[PDB]
């Protein structure tokens with residue numbers, strides 16, 4: 001990124017080092033990129049990338065027989081550099097992903113197969129997800145939205161560094177209704193104590209998904225406050241994570257929530273599907289059910305939707321009838337100031353202070369007129 | 384009902400008796416109707432009819448003060464024949480139905496009050512229903528539709544005489560998924576045994592709603608098969624009840640299901656409302672979710688909707704494109720014969736063999752043309 005084309009004569013790069021790390025710095029300047037691996041490499045005859053690859057072609061209906069499988073193996077990048085394929089096919093058979101009809105040896109997708117493909121889910125993750133859902137449908141808590149959120153809470157990657165001492169403090173202060181959900185999932189208070197007392201991550205044993213469970217329940221709490229319209233600064237102080245890690249999490253959970261919804265629909269689990277089908281939109285914007293209609297407008301996010309709701313505008317229909325200058329004023333009240341704000345400067349009438357995507361700078365007035373204009377266009381398309 | 388006006392010269396009535404019951408028969412011929420009671424009569428200072436009456440006028444907003452209450456007491460039929468009112472007002476206060484603001488002594492409705500009124504529910508029944516729902520939301524089974532049905536299964540009157548021996552036979556053969564729902568509700572196997580072994584109805588103690596629970600769970604099983612499109616004859620043989628008692632039950636449960644849905648909506652219980660809001664339509668016709676669209680047509684019931692679904696017509700949209708004579712044929716296949724049916728009689732082309740409400744006799748042809756005609760009119764109103 002050193003050197004602007006058409007602007008600079010040269011691009012300069014400086015790597016600051018010490019005498020001790022002097023040799024490692026030179027290694028980088030002379031270093032070159034490593035050769036590209038296939039990521040489908042084989043004491044592991046089976047592998048995730050291959051299992052998914054084989055599942056996609058069989059369920060999709062472009063690979064039926066055993067001859068089609070090895071023909072596919074020829075097209076891979078792994079074979080370009082110049083058994084394992086057969087192992088993945090059996091794996092799909094053992095775990096009810098694929099069917100075999102002896103037309104000798106022809107493979108067809110199951111309901112679980114077609115569901116996994118439509119859900120864009122990884123076959124390795126689908127097994128635990130399928131069990132987790134069946135476990136939840138045997139005993140489910142409906143008095144709050146926490147248990148539902150847990151099912152759509154992603155835990156395939158760490159989104160933040162969790163302070164366990166902070167976690168235990170929230171555990172005790174946690175209401176009884178949410179402790180019931182914790183117990184029902186696997187959250188044991190004993191494991192939480194062995195985390196604060198001693199910084200033993202363990203996780204060496206495969207059976208230590210016990211760690212992931214507590215990380216997942218911690219995350220669901222964050223997502224619970226998030227769709228409860230709890231301020232980002234409160235969530236930051238309460239949990240110990242920045243706004244960057246949160247936004248990356250909600251956009252991840254919004255997508256994941258859609259996956260579990262599709263997965264539940266293709267298996268015929270209507271009751272479970274019915275509950276989940278409202279959280280994709282709520283996780284995206286971080287809102288409650290009431291603001292779901294307002295946030296259809298492009299410029300209206302969580303903060304702008306709430307202040308317009310609390311001012312009499314509950315729906316797009318109510319927002320189309322709106323007086324523009326009234327919308328503008330309500331927007332002006334949602335701004336965050338360090339001092340308890342909420343002189344006359346008439347030189348700020350042209351200040352473009354509202355950002356969009358692929359944006360021209362919008363004034364607070366122009367944005368308001370756009371919100372009312374868009375609301376009317378949507379109101380007509382609703383008929 | 385003896386004597387047709389404009390037809391008969393006299394109407395004759397004969398009461399057949401023996402010598403032993405001779406005196407009781409004469410008592411009827413000379414007998415006259417008893418005076419009409421008020422049904423709001425008072426060791427019972429409080430009474431159901433009064434509590435409901437007082438609740439309706441306060442929540443509705445036509446009675447606020449204490450003066451309005453006794454003014455209402457004057458308009459009653461009980462006072463027409465010429466304390467207790469004050470007792471009912473306190474009862475509504477004790478059970479969170481009504482609020483009191485000391486403008487000395489002014490009464491307003493609570494959320495629980497406004498919910499009960501909108502639900503058309505009796506205040507006496509609302510207390511147990513409110514507890515039952517809160518109990519269900521703490522631990523709910525979603526793998527089947529049984530637990531949801533239990534919440535909308537009415538038990539304020541007996542709809543049939545339950546054979547307990549038959550019940551215990553269905554209990555053992557009952558799958559594990561439905562035994563979990565039974566335990567979760569209150570169905571104890573010990574009580575079922577003390578019913579078959581000994582015909583002890585008990586029910587003298589008020590705390591013996593334990594009887595109602597088992598009667599309610601028995602009923603939910605019937606409703607489960609009913610919306611699973613299990614034949615009426617199978618349900619008759621399996622449970623021991625006639626088709627008359629069943630139809631009276633489903634139309635009762637369809638109405639009740641709507642009540643619990645409204646009740647849940649006014650309390651803000653969205654998750655619970657979401658699950659219940661699909662069973663009013665299914666209980667009415669006795670169908671599965673797939674036939675919900677077809678049964679919008681007036682002439683299409685459960686039986687006609689299924690045979691049209693299994694023949695390629697899944698929606699009203701598919702049914703508007705239908706060839707009339709094809710619909711007619713599919714209908715002809717749904718008819719029940721004692722022999723394994725499903726000569727050429729062309730004299731039955733005018734036989735009106737299909738009944739409607741406020742009906743002219745419809746031929747199987749005319750009905751088919753009406754179904755396709757109605758489907759098209761509905762398809763246009765859907766846009």
Ligand SMILES: [K+]
Pocket residue numbers: 295296297298299300301
């Ligand atoms: K938006």
Ligand SMILES: [K+]
Pocket residue numbers: 678679680681682683684
């Ligand atoms: K109908």
